[PDB]
UniProtKB/TrEMBL annotation, chain B:
One of its GO terms (molecular function) is endonuclease activity. The keyword Hydrolase applies. InterPro entries: Restrct_endonuc_II_Bpu10I (IPR018577). It comes from the Bacteria. It holds the Pfam family RE_Bpu10I. Keywords: Endonuclease, Hydrolase, Nuclease. This is BbvCI endonuclease subunit 2. The gene is bbvCIR-2.
Amino acid sequence: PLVYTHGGKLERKSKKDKTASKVFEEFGVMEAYNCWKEASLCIQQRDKDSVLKLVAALNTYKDAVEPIFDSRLNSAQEVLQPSILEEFFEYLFSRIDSIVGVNIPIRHPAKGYLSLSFNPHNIETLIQSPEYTVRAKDHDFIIGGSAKLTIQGHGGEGETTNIVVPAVAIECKRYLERNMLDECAGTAERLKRATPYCLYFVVAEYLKLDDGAPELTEIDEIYILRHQRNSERNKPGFKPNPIDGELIWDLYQEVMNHLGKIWWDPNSALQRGKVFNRP
Amino acid sequence: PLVYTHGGKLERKSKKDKTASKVFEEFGVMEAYNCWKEASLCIQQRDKDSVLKLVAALNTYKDAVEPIFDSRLNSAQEVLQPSILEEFFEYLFSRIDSIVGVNIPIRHPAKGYLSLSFNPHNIETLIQSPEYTVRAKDHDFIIGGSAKLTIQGHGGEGETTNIVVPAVAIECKRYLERNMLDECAGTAERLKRATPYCLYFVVAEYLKLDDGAPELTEIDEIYILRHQRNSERNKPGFKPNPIDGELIWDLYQEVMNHLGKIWWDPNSALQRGKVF
């Protein structure tokens, strides 16, 4: 198995909560899930209809399962539903190796690198082997690479830390309220300092944002997948929109573009006379 | 109305340095300059060919005087040479009032607002009349507005400061090296915090190649006008490329769009959503 973020939380949640285990048994969550997974992995191409099909299965599984997580559970809006989308992105980008050339080690939730700072214990350790911190940051989904960072002082053979250098990072939220969109603006800033070529998206199903006023962030795209407000979800009669396959198709197109580009290329700068060729 | 930055630095430099004054007359800098100016003001339209024409005059004037500035002048890349493009932008945007609807006060070099912090002398002045500082930053060229900022205490008239709130800010550099592109990243960050809707450009003639991946954190566009490297200028065979009128045409098009757009809209920014 590649990653399967959702599937694993299913098995972990049922391995720690026996209540939940029976709920998953009784309402056939596990069959629903396996079905979703099977449906998704067999989609081999990535033309628009291919992608639309994945979204189709996504909608189905969410329709089949989310109501159980809402009414039959207790704590399922923390790391049980936010993972359906995480795993979805795993499927969406399962077949990119063959298409972008190389074998990308990271296409799951991951801590994306931000900073390296030095916190030596004392003058001796400073000289001999300075203690350091790498600050990273949880993202719901990262396409990127794994690196080893080592610091050696006079003595040691160096403390090593494993780090993740992201090329795309995606936040995945059921609904996007202002509190969260501030976090995301905030880490976009940091993220762009650390990894200037990391594309950064926030993706939500609903937008729970009070009309307020517009925000210049360093986020490359926000996506509200169901085109709806959150005011609508807990009122008279249900009726949620499907997750819009169009948006996912777009998001896919932009990421693949990104992984296609040489990101510095001064030669093409000089050639054109612009560093930021936006057509 | 119409500011003339280069002309004035010519005028300043010569009242100051009398050696340079003689150099200016001997090599006919003054005639060259006003010719450049004359040529430029009489182009009134702003279609693509119009703009190309201005660039033509630009290239000529640069060709006519830059050599003098290099050879015959002590120190000239400080402001003398950079001011040419500054003034050029003055000509390029001289007819925007009639095109954008409003009478824009500022289209010259200017200090663009950045921050307000409070540094009161003591507890009394804190209450009574707090002392403050406005931090602004020199830009090569700004389209924007003037504003007056007043702070009033408990009892008093309030200290006023004049400030400039830019809509477009353009840096103008002959050549762009890593060291400078960091400065520009650095002030872009500040600038975007202070004035989120201010477009921010760097415009250069030559750009250094091998130097290292730079920080272009929040610069809206860089322009290398001559498409060349900055290491070909002091080699056996000169051969500098003309400033590319295509690029200037672009830059013009981007700025005019910017000034045409509604920027901030407090209560009609829901549809925006997830397009663009």
